[PDB]
């Protein structure tokens, strides 16, 4: 379970701000799309609108901070749950080909606000890459994400 502590609220605000690039306190479909596109995805307007509709209690077409937190309360689970690890793999695997490359990892990490140095990227890939193909598949990813 997550708590509404000052520290946690600040973390959620950081996430909200990633989307709310104009700082107007609302996340639009345009803003959702810009972030997803930065991760190699190209969702339809329908897909973007559906995400808003999940928590758009006032029906104004955008997500405000309370609605965003309602989404987090509904969706968020343990960091090592099966569904969070599969969803994390899909995000890092920009092209959906079943392997996370160094280029993908670097791109996704910086566009989500946690830029890695090339040394941090190479280190993560090297250590997670058990089969030696230079990339990280789902099974390797699970191992990396669960190993303590």
């Amino acid at each position: 379970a997550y708590q509404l502590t000052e520290e946690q609220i600040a973390e959620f605000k950081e996430a909200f701000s990633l989307f709310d690039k104009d700082g107007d306190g609302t996340i639009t479909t345009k803003e959702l799309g810009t972030v997803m596109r930065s991760l190699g995805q190209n969702p339809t307007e329908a897909e973007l609108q559906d995400m808003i509709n999940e928590v758009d209690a006032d029906g104004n077409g955008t997500i405000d901070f309370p609605e965003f937190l309602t989404m987090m309360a509904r969706k968020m689970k343990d960091t090592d749950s099966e569904e969070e690890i599969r969803e994390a793999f899909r995000v890092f695997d920009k092209d959906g080909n079943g392997y996370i490359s160094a280029a993908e990892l670097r791109h996704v990490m910086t566009n989500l606000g946690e830029k890695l140095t090339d040394e941090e990227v190479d280190e993560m890939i090297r250590e997670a890459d058990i089969d030696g193909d230079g990339q990280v598949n789902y099974e390797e990813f699970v191992q990396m994400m669960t190993a303590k």
Binding site: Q8, E11, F12, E14, A15, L18, F19, V35, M36, L39, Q41, M71, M72, K75, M76, T79, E84, E87, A88, V91, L105, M109, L112, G113, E114, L116, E120, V121, E123, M124, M144, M145
Partner: peptide, 19 residues
């Protein structure tokens, strides 16, 4: 280790659930 800690940071602020 450090890259993994950063991934955990992204998870705990909900960015995997959003993306």
């Amino acid at each position: 280790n450090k890259a993994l800690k950063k991934i955990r940071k992204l998870q705990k602020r909900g960015l995997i659930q959003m993306t």
